[PDB]
Design a binder for this molecule. Sequence first.
Ligand code: HEC
Length: 112
Amino acid sequence: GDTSPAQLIAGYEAAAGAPADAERGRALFLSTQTGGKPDTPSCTTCHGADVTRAGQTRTGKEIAPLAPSATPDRFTDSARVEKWLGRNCNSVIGRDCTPGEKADLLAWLAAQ
Ligand code: HEC
């Protein structure tokens, strides 16, 4: 694509002022939130708790696995990551994700 997963995470770490923490990324992805839309309390609502398996939209359509081990071109387009993180962080958490959250989330997801 136009980027690597490491280039994306390094850009978020620089904006956050701190290195990514994959354990924090895992905890946020699996968390149940209450600030967003009622139908999407968690990232897992659509991507599941195991991102090597397919996910599902709110209507039951299949979403390709988020793990790069299952779907190889993941996180290789910078605009596509921002586009989905913009929409999905707002739906789940109710606000954009911070650069530190994005760094943490991608560092966990990029290793799956
Ligand atoms: C359903 C309403 C979703 C919720 C809740 C979350 N995501 Fe999602 N995500 C969804 C779709 C339909 C898509 C696009 C289709 C695809 O196969 O990519 C995505 C995509 C992403 C991506 C982009 C991956 C890439 O190709 O670079 C990321 C990084 C992502 N989703 C992360 C993510 C997080 C962190 C979420 C909780 C805040 C989350 N998603 C929720 C559908 C839905």
